[PDB]
Design an enzyme around this catalytic site. Structure first.
Site, PDB file in Angstrom:
ATOM      1  N   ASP A  44       0.761  -1.244   0.000  1.00  0.00           N
ATOM      2  CA  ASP A  44       0.000   0.000   0.000  1.00  0.00           C
ATOM      3  C   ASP A  44       0.794   1.299   0.000  1.00  0.00           C
ATOM      4  OD1 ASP A  44      -2.774  -1.127   0.026  1.00  0.00           O
ATOM      5  OD2 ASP A  44      -2.052  -2.032   1.888  1.00  0.00           O
ATOM      6  N   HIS A  70      -1.622  -9.171   7.329  1.00  0.00           N
ATOM      7  CA  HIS A  70      -1.464  -7.731   7.432  1.00  0.00           C
ATOM      8  C   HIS A  70      -0.114  -7.569   8.121  1.00  0.00           C
ATOM      9  CE1 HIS A  70      -5.306  -6.262   6.017  1.00  0.00           C
ATOM     10  NE2 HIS A  70      -5.933  -7.171   6.738  1.00  0.00           N
ATOM     11  N   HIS A 112      -5.025 -13.119   8.917  1.00  0.00           N
ATOM     12  CA  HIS A 112      -6.460 -12.927   8.914  1.00  0.00           C
ATOM     13  C   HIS A 112      -7.295 -14.029   8.287  1.00  0.00           C
ATOM     14  CE1 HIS A 112     -10.042 -10.000   7.909  1.00  0.00           C
ATOM     15  NE2 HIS A 112     -10.412 -11.054   8.614  1.00  0.00           N
TER      16      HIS A 112
HETATM   17  O1  LIG Z   1      -5.229  -2.430  -1.942  1.00  0.00           O
HETATM   18  C1  LIG Z   1      -4.825  -3.157  -2.808  1.00  0.00           C
HETATM   19  C2  LIG Z   1      -4.569  -2.764  -4.276  1.00  0.00           C
HETATM   20  C3  LIG Z   1      -5.777  -1.973  -4.834  1.00  0.00           C
HETATM   21  C4  LIG Z   1      -5.629  -0.648  -5.241  1.00  0.00           C
HETATM   22  C5  LIG Z   1      -6.748   0.091  -5.735  1.00  0.00           C
HETATM   23  C6  LIG Z   1      -8.022  -0.484  -5.830  1.00  0.00           C
HETATM   24  C7  LIG Z   1      -8.184  -1.806  -5.431  1.00  0.00           C
HETATM   25  C8  LIG Z   1      -7.066  -2.566  -4.928  1.00  0.00           C
HETATM   26 CU   LIG Z   2      -7.485  -8.623   6.729  1.00  0.00          CU
END
Ligand SMILES: O=CCc1ccccc1
Ligand SMILES: [Cu+2]
Ligand SMILES: O=CCc1ccccc1
Ligand SMILES: [NH3+]CCc1ccccc1
Ligand SMILES: [Ca+2]
Ligand SMILES: [Ca+2]
Ligand SMILES: [Ca+2]
Ligand SMILES: [Ca+2]
Ligand SMILES: [Cu+2]
Lengths: 718, 720
Positions: free
Chosen positions: A377, A520, A683
């Site tokens: 992320d 996570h 998870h």
């Molecule tokens: O969070 C994971 C990658 C992602 C980024 C943007 C939209 C959906 C999924």
């Molecule tokens: Cu999760």
């Protein structure tokens, strides 16, 4: 005159009217105001203020001067915010600097037309000079510089600009490095899929009647040494799709086994992987309450009628014995800098810089639409850029102060994030207590200063709290909420034929929906300077040893203490039953013990714990991201080593993060150390987390260990 | 006539706030939030107008009120926090009268003795089934109110059962080889015996003490050592550890090391005095009440609920959102949470029939004479309920708390009301959930937790227990520890002194001549969960990495090994926070076909290092006597008589009469009434930051609903 409620609410202030007292109570961040209709004065944080024009009631509607908000709120009686006359050297780039830096690289003849900006941040001044500014008010005699990372198509170019002198210092193309995903890439993917006849055909095959209701998601593809059939030089993204059914929640409608591979530069799908067809779960599963009615609840307010205990000068925050600097980064978010603890008059160093290092959310399903799913992320999407403005009174308590922060967007234009960070003090049970039998009780309440930031990338919403305790302890909690990534399956209940196969890699949380198991994993970069730069890593393992003193006891409780002198040995699993200290072998407390800070990578969590990476050591994600498999790491301070997953983790072929930073196995004896804490959860889903998951938390802790000579909160001696 | 407002309201325990600008008083006391202006006809109570008989009068800047103001306002009824119980709950603790009735009944027995004290006078639990029928079906318990009366006749334990409904004795059974717990008068007895001991005064004098009148003693149980401690098993004994009173209000900081007297209670004499090397008593004043400190300025912060609470307290039953439960007080283990149900869209579903502290132990690791036997079972040997510490309004609990009084019997059988015994309060705990879909309106809801807090102080330690009911069905249970540490007197002033190494072998040097002897804090909770019914099964779910057999690039996958734990023996185990353990109801499933269950998490975090087990070699008696110390999870078959991890009579016990005993027959745990026991501890290695007084340290446990519901529990009432 002008309407009060109308004007005040546009200002973001909360308005309370008490008919019994004929009193208005106005609240916004640090300001707590009380004004009575017709009164010639008002009260701001306990202090009297003369009014030019009293508040007047007109048809049961209060009215105020068109200068009211300024005279009352900008009066000066609210001391929460103080002006910064001398700009702190770690202040984030200002809007003007962001625009100056962009002008500098655009003036170069090498700057290509549609170049984007992955990151435009302050180039870190030298640590020594910064500490000198914070501790001695000594000016930083070095020009403010900014790192400017550009993405020309798919090519990364690193540039450095001198902001004080307005000049380009360097321009370096970065070979074989892929750029993170940028906002415009989200639209491209959707628009490319939309104009794809083949994709539209593939979708029709799977039961979708209207392709214009297909929602795409941009997913990084990772690295598999070619086994995934993907060209290592092409800037790619995989597209997982969902069906919008108007319930405001397309995540509840996966189009399973359909994966499109998009080449961002050629702007077209270069591969469509199709697996078994699974009917799309259609049932509406909104999460915004459109189909709900909340139960009535009595009001609850947390108030500080005299203002806050903290002061915010520019970005410097002062509270009790704490002093630190808070800044924003588009990639990792909040950065806590130059943290000191005022020990009875003297400011002692605690942490030079602390912030999120990086995080990853890898999945455990081998199928076509999940095997490559491993989200970084911050690294691949930029959590600072995707900061979610705090919902006053909900994401943070009602006595909080909400700060706005500024960063640069991908086109190099300043972007002000409203309510990007929340600062609030809170009661946290008794600091200490002792009720000696038959004697007057002794209790003092505990207060914690919390700095909260929330970033949302796709479906996960992440919450980070940097908690400062009055007694010197520092907590760092990470919470996770949002919408789970689900797999479409044929089974409706556990009694169906495919139920067993459908739930092999995840729990069946809803009809035809399985919450694929995943982890996570959060990593925090903590450049701690325990009462100084030069420190050492010390281990203290509580052990049971045979009694040699005599008497009935056969065993005793002793401690096994020893130093950990290098990076390789510092990289280790954490036993919450052992103790790990970063000590300063050059300074001791009143009893002769080295002033230290106890490092606790795992202090708790509401979800099962991740002991390491749930991956065989031969998995590529495992090879690329070493930080996942160890809870503690300690390396030598280096200005360019700030990310556990490496600087350019997109489709990386090897570990350029903590694996690289510790590769050398350098000495950690009496030198500048940087602690990295990895804490994660495994998870396994349940029905209680669908359609939306109740916030789950993990906790970490940094405790002073013989840093002081006694209970830090007793207070100064008379 | 009238009386001063401040003085009187303070006496009453109400917070008094005066706003000079608004000429308004704000009064807060439990569920009552009041506003009153001087000279006004009415006052406001929880947003409702109240006509006053006599208005508040302001005289020369001093407010005065009617002598009836407190009753008229605070007991008006506009504060609906407390409601009268119309039909007495079968689990209500014995009343003052019942307590007195039970005592008269046993004193009517020809065998009752004068010096006969009472270790415990508590309600005798009706059958579980009837109580559940009353809570769920409202069916009356037609079984007579009975009471257990455990007496101590000298040193002999006698168990009597009285029938309160028919005012008659049902049984009187002596318990051989059982020792009674430590009673309040034993404390005074010990101090007195030491004061009258010519020898002890001599032993003390040679150890540098001049005035023996300043010697403070402490009553410690001796445990059991098969005789190696050279102590007759038959006699009722206690060891005495001494300290010197220097006048700083903290004698704990002035240990008289290596001096231990063994006292025989019934004989009221010192039967033995063990002496070790002489160590100068740490003299330096180390007060913890702030007498020598500067009071730092802090701005006010109040948590208020101006319209009353969201919960209601009828008799002893608490209703809050979807939760319903009964709260009572026991003299030994303290607070008892009973008949806990969760209203699922109209239907009350069972969660926990009875939950409470099981027992706890704080064992030390120093082999010397003044420490080798030291291992406290606070509730078992001292009675934590009895030693409850009144909550300090606003400090031990947030300002928006409601403080409950609880009544128990003292050792002489006389009713005892503990003021501010338990605190109940709702608290903001961040967002319940949140999702900010990009480019869309944000979605967030705040989280609220109802906390039930109790604090008990036994000697130098102060223990805090919170029972946390989350609105989403989760139940948390935390244990906090604070107070003053038990230190050892040593010769070293710093780690640079010659004896430092030896003086700190069993603990950290936290102050000059003072060592914080390492030890553990082991808590155990007895949780009789009835997950949507009595018949449950224990299920294990171990996340595991298994080879990829589905094709593709991946070499591994994340799967789960699921199996049942069919017997008590296999249920007694260590807890790996990386695995999942569920108490499921094999007879009931949710909308997806999964067994409605609750996830049991004995270890959800803590601020001190975690105790992986008992820090004792397997051949130590304490380890032998108390096996609950080494496992974090236990599950046994329901039995009304099995309620303590350490055993019913732990004082000088020879063998495990608790969890070791309750699971010795290794019974079946398949589809039957289960009782969960969670053990959670910490290993405490001291540091200077904890002296002279220790900042509260916490440990967390958790019980989460697992497929007990069909969706996010807090989404709200379905509109269609
Ligand atoms: O969070 C994971 C990658 C992602 C980024 C943007 C939209 C959906 C999924
Ligand atoms: Cu999760
Ligand atoms: O709390 C444990 C045993 C004890 C009791 C009373 C005073 C000191 C120590
Ligand atoms: N040289 C610093 C950046 C800058 C640019 C324009 C106005 C103010 C500041
Ligand atoms: Ca450092
Ligand atoms: Ca290095
Ligand atoms: Ca049994
Ligand atoms: Ca049960
Ligand atoms: Cu302790």
């Amino acid at each position: 005159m002008v309407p009060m409620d109308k004007t005040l609410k546009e200002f973001g202030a909360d308005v309370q009217w008490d008919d019994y007292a004929q009193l208005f109570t106005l609240i916004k961040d640090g300001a707590y105001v009380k004004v009575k209709p017709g009164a010639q004065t008002a009260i701001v944080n306990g202090q009297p203020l003369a009014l030019q024009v009293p508040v007047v009631m007109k048809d049961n509607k209060a009215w105020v001067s068109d200068t009211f908000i300024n005279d009352v709120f900008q009066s000066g009686l609210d001391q929460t915010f103080q002006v910064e006359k001398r700009p702190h050297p770690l202040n984030a780039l200002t809007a003007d600097e962001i625009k100056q830096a962009v002008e500098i690289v655009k003036a170069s003849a090498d700057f290509k037309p549609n170049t984007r900006f992955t990151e435009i941040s302050l180039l870190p001044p030298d640590k020594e000079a910064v500490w000198a500014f914070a501790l001695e008010n000594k000016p930083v005699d070095q020009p403010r510089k900014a790192d400017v990372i550009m993405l020309d198509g798919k090519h990364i170019i690193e540039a450095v600009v001198d902001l004080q002198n307005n000049k380009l210092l360097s321009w370096q193309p970065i070979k074989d490095a892929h750029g993170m995903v940028l906002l415009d890439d989200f639209a491209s993917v959707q628009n490319i899929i939309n104009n794809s006849e083949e994709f539209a055909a593939a979708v029709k095959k799977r039961g979708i009647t209207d392709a214009k209701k297909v929602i795409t998601t941009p997913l990084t593809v990772g690295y598999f040494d070619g086994k995934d059939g993907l060209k290592q030089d092409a800037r790619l993204l995989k597209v997982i799709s969902y069906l919008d059914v108007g319930d405001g929640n397309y995540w509840a409608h996966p189009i399973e086994n359909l994966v499109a591979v998009v080449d961002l530069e050629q702007k077209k799908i270069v591969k469509i992987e199709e697996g078994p067809v699974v009917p799309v779960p259609m049932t509406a599963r909104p999460f915004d309450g459109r189909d709900r009615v909340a139960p009535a609840v009595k009001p609850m307010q947390i108030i500080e009628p005299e203002g806050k205990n903290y002061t915010i000068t520019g970005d410097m925050i002062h509270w009790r014995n704490w002093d630190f600097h808070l800044s924003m980064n588009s990639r990792v978010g909040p950065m806590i800098s130059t943290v000191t603890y005022n020990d009875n008059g003297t400011k002692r160093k605690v942490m030079y810089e602390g912030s999120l290092g990086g995080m990853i959310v890898p999945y455990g399903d081998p199928d076509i639409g999940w095997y490559f799913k491993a989200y970084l992320d911050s690294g691949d999407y930029g959590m600072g850029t995707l900061t979610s403005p705090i919902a006053r009174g909900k994401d943070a308590p009602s006595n909080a102060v909400l700060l706005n922060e500024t960063i640069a967007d991908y086109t190099g234009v300043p972007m002000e994030i409203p309510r990007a960070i929340a600062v609030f003090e809170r009661y946290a049970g008794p600091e200490y207590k002792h009720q000696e039998m038959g004697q007057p009780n002794v209790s003092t309440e505990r207060r914690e200063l919390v700095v909260r930031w929330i970033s949302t990338v796709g479906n996960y919403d992440y919450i980070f709290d940097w908690i400062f305790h009055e007694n010197g302890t520092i907590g760092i909690d990470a919470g996770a909420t949002g919408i789970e990534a689900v797999k479409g399956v044929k089974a409706k209940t556990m009694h169906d034929e495919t139920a067993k196969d459908d739930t092999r890699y995840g729990t069946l949380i809803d009809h035809n929906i399985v919450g694929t198991t995943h982890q996570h994993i959060y990593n925090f970069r903590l450049d701690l300077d325990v009462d100084g730069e030069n420190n050492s890593l010390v281990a203290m393992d509580p052990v049971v040893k045979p009694n040699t003193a005599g008497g009935p006891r056969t065993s005793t409780m002793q401690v096994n203490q020893y130093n950990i002198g290098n990076e390789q040995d510092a990289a280790q699993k954490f036993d919450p039953g052992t103790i790990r200290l970063l000590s300063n072998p050059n300074k001791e407390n009143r009893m002769g013990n080295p002033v230290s800070y106890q490092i606790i990578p795992y202090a708790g969590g509401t979800h099962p714990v991740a002991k390491g990476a749930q991956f065989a050591p031969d998995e590529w994600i495992y090879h690329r991201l070493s930080f996942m498999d160890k809870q503690l790491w300690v390396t030598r301070y280096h200005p360019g080593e700030r990310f556990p997953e490496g600087k350019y983790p997109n489709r990386s072929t090897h570990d350029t993060g903590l694996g690289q930073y510790s590769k050398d196995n350098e000495s950690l004896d009496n030198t500048d150390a940087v602690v990295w804490m990895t804490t994660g959860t495994t998870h396994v889903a349940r029905a209680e987390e669908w359609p939306i998951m109740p916030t789950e938390w993990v906790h970490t802790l940094l405790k002073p260990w013989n840093f002081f000579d006694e209970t830090p909160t007793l207070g100064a001696l008379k």
